[PDB]
């Protein structure tokens, strides 16, 4: 099906080759065509290497696709809604397991996906709010991280 497919073309008009391989949305941008003063300050930007010549010739920008972000958000949601009687420890164990399920999977892409970082922080705050409501109905003004 075309609508469930993606075709990316690189030509004299397009300098970027885009594809989501296994959840990693990658944009390959050749250095030769459109680049200047290549860097390393961004941690989710794979430097490529031409094995025949051993020179930095491309640049793979990594990103976490919308499907993975939505899946993680739904996982956090079904953790939270399935908390009728689960202990706080069980909820937080599920949260940590879900977090490192993708974070060790999506490692460098998480840095470049700002919306994923916002979603992660939002879901962690949701977990904390769930626990705090479990303690007492009235949410506290402050509450220590310890």
């Amino acid at each position: 099906q075309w609508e469930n497919s993606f075709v990316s073309v690189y030509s004299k008009d397009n300098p970027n080759l885009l594809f989501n391989m296994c959840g990693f949305e990658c944009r390959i941008l050749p250095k030769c065509r459109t680049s200047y003063e290549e860097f390393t300050h961004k941690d989710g930007v794979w430097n490529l290497q031409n094995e025949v010549t051993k020179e930095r010739t491309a640049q793979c920008f990594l990103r976490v696709d919308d499907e993975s972000m939505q899946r993680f958000h739904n996982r956090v949601r079904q953790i939270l809604m399935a908390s009728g009687s689960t202990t706080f420890t069980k909820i937080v164990n599920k949260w940590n397991t879900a977090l490192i399920g993708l974070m060790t999977y999506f490692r460098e892409a998480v840095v470049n996906t700002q919306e994923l970082l916002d979603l992660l922080v939002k879901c962690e705050n949701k977990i904390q709010t769930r626990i705090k409501i479990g303690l007492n109905s009235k949410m506290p003004s402050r509450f220590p991280p310890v």
Binding site: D43, L117, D118, V121, N125, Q128, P140, S141, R142, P144
Partner: peptide, 22 residues
């Protein structure tokens, strides 16, 4: 001071993933 979690977007200027983990 508050316990609310702050998004580290814009907090990555001087940090790397492999740093402080050897």
């Amino acid at each position: 001071p508050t316990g609310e979690v702050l998004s580290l977007v814009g907090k990555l200027e001087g940090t790397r993933m492999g740093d402080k983990a050897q």
